[PDB]
Amino acid sequence: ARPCIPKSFGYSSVVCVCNATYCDSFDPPTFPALGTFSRYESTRSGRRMELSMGPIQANHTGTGLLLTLQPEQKFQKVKGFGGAMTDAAALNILALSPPAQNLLLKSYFSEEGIGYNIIRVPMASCDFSIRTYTYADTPDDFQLHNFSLPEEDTKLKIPLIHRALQLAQRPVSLLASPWTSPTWLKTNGAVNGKGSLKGQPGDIYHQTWARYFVKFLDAYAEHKLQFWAVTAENEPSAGLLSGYPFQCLGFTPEHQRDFIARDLGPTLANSTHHNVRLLMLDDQRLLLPHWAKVVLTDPEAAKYVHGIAVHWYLDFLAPAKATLGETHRLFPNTMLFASEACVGSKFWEQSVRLGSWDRGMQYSHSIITNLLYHVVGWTDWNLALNPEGGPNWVRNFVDSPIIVDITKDTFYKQPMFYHLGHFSKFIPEGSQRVGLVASQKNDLDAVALMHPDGSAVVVVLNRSSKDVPLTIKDPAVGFLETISPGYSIHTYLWRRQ
Numbered sequence: 001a002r003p004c005i006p007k008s009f010g011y012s013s014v015v016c017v018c019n020a021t022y023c024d025s026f027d028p029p030t031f032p033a034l035g036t037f038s039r040y041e042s043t044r045s046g047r048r049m050e051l052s053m054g055p056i057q058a059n060h061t062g063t064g065l066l067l068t069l070q071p072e073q074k075f076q077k078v079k080g081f082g083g084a085m086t087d088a089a090a091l092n093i094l095a096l097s098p099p100a101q102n103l104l105l106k107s108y109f110s111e112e113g114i115g116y117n118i119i120r121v122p123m124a125s126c127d128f129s130i131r132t133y134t135y136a137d138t139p140d141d142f143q144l145h146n147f148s149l150p151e152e153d154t155k156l157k158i159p160l161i162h163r164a165l166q167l168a169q170r171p172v173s174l175l176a177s178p179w180t181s182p183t184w185l186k187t188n189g190a191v192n193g194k195g196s197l198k199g200q201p202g203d204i205y206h207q208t209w210a211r212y213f214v215k216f217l218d219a220y221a222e223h224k225l226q227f228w229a230v231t232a233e234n235e236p237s238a239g240l241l242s243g244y245p246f247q248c249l250g251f252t253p254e255h256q257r258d259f260i261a262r263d264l265g266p267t268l269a270n271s272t273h274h275n276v277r278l279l280m281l282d283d284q285r286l287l288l289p290h291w292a293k294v295v296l297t298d299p300e301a302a303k304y305v306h307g308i309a310v311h312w313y314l315d316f317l318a319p320a321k322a323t324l325g326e327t328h329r330l331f332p333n334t335m336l337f338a339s340e341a342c343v344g345s346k347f348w349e350q351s352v353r354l355g356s357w358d359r360g361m362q363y364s365h366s367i368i369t370n371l372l373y374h375v376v377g378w379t380d381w382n383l384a385l386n387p388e389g390g391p392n393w394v395r396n397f398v399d400s401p402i403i404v405d406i407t408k409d410t411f412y413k414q415p416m417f418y419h420l421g422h423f424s425k426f427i428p429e430g431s432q433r434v435g436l437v438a439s440q441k442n443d444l445d446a447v448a449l450m451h452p453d454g455s456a457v458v459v460v461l462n463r464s465s466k467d468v469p470l471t472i473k474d475p476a477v478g479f480l481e482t483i484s485p486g487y488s489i490h491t492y493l494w495r496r497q
């Protein structure tokens, strides 16, 4: 409804500029009339989810690329898409004027924006905090009498989450993850560095830690927030590394298995929060299938584990077939869920690259690859950062789909935002991935889903410089004659009946 105001920062594409009085917006999604398709197009050249429509033809002839929908062939159902309400994100959002804040929140959470339905919530401090703290810093408080939410939660994160929920028309699922325990529960007595819980699963340290999860959920429940899921620990492999720079808590897969079986599983199950899902791993997919095998082959751990959460940071050296594919094969009834991604965290990556088309393509390529290998959802990291990629108490700066420029009471929506939206806006919870097969080898990334009502949604990414003419065949409906321009992403929608 309102066009992108483009600005170049000298990278491959433009950001869209928003402030207190203006932000680009979309219309709520709709399917067009039977016999017509919709196309939403974003390009490096600056098109931002532009709507066009076309006819579905009864016939097709030619030798060009054909993508054929296989609507009967069903895969995973989609949980959703969203991002993380870190301390850093909360600070950046609230540093904007109230009108600008509302436009940012609407960008993500309204149907005039990209319809996020997941928010990841850190349990106390992480690197994307300006303060190191837990919820129970009073030493040796095994009873957790001094457990409490600080202002980071009560003043910053919780009110923003409530505002996001008000804007969202879709049901929103909250996901909680801890980085570190209180230091008095840890072998190293520090928030960072190499260190695990003291002792062994089933003991006082482990029982206290499990009870901390319940205290956290109790406290958020007092604030009228309920959780869909928690993870067992953010990046448990991190705490195994000498000199790890920020908040962590080390678990081997054996340690995680035993913690879930003995402490976390029984504790949650015997609480008012028994319906909250537990996700294991919450770490790089390079650790699969090994980690899934260790945890899920133990029935006492398995009965508590709803899903496997994966992070994207080692995807470049962990092929999806050998990790996601093999895990799905062995454990087809345990969902895979992508719970954290961002560009900028790597040694060879600058933190923020305003307007980078490459980083947009990284997001969409990742989401497509995940969807093609059974993953049910995909979650960004910080919802918003400043132009430095912070704040961050160890200066571990990274990129974010929205960058906030407080001096100008402005925020910039980057290619990553639009790439994510090509999925989030058009794929409601309960959509199902269906087959889509190419007639010939090609440079495109594509995925097909069936909307809950039976309609079709297809996303096509072209990471190459070359325009690719193609046809999409829906055997029941007809043919879509289209093009995939170089450096474009398209979302196709059409009714099937």
Ligand SMILES: *[C@@H]1O[C@H](CO)[C@@H](O[C@@H]2O[C@H](CO)[C@@H](O[C@@H]3O[C@H](CO[C@H]4O[C@H](CO)[C@@H](O)[C@H](O)[C@@H]4O)[C@@H](O)[C@H](O)[C@@H]3O)[C@H](O)[C@H]2NC(C)=O)[C@H](O)[C@H]1NC(C)=O
Residues within 6 Å of the ligand: 005, 017, 018, 019, 020, 021, 022
């Ligand atoms: C918040 O963001 C708004 C959008 O960036 C800001 O409004 C913009 O302010 C600039 C500076 O006054 C204006 O730029 C001028 O534009 C006209 C041409 O304008 C019209 O055509 C353009 C086509 O590009 C179209 O976008 C507009 O809607 C107008 O119809 C030039 O002739 C001038 O030389 C100068 O470049 C923009 O017109 C204006 N945009 C909008 C959408 O209103 C606003 O100032 C920002 N607010 C704060 C508080 O900073």
Ligand SMILES: *[C@@H]1O[C@H](CO)[C@@H](O)[C@H](O)[C@H]1NC(C)=O
Residues within 6 Å of the ligand: 058, 059
């Ligand atoms: C489509 O194909 C069928 C079968 O060959 C043919 O009868 C029909 O005339 C073709 N053209 C159109 C416009 O439907």
Ligand SMILES: *[C@@H]1O[C@H](CO)[C@@H](O)[C@H](O)[C@H]1NC(C)=O
Residues within 6 Å of the ligand: 138, 145, 146
């Ligand atoms: C911890 O809680 C106990 C019991 O409520 C209370 O007596 C004590 O003052 C608290 N200590 C701190 C450091 O808040």
Ligand SMILES: O[C@H]1[C@H](O)[C@@H](Cl)C=C[C@@H]1O
Residues within 6 Å of the ligand: 039, 041, 052, 482, 483, 484, 485
């Ligand atoms: O921008 C174009 C797009 O690239 C092609 Cl595929 C079709 C319709 C749009 O208007």
Ligand SMILES: *[C@H]1CC[C@@H](O)[C@H](O)[C@H]1O
Residues within 6 Å of the ligand: 126, 127, 128, 234, 235, 311, 340, 345, 396
């Ligand atoms: C995911 C990657 C980047 C870090 O900022 C974050 O803490 C980690 O869990």
Ligand code: NA
Residues within 6 Å of the ligand: 164, 165, 166, 167, 168, 169, 170
């Ligand atoms: Na709502």
Ligand code: NA
Residues within 6 Å of the ligand: 344, 345, 346, 347, 348, 349, 350, 351, 397
């Ligand atoms: Na970096």
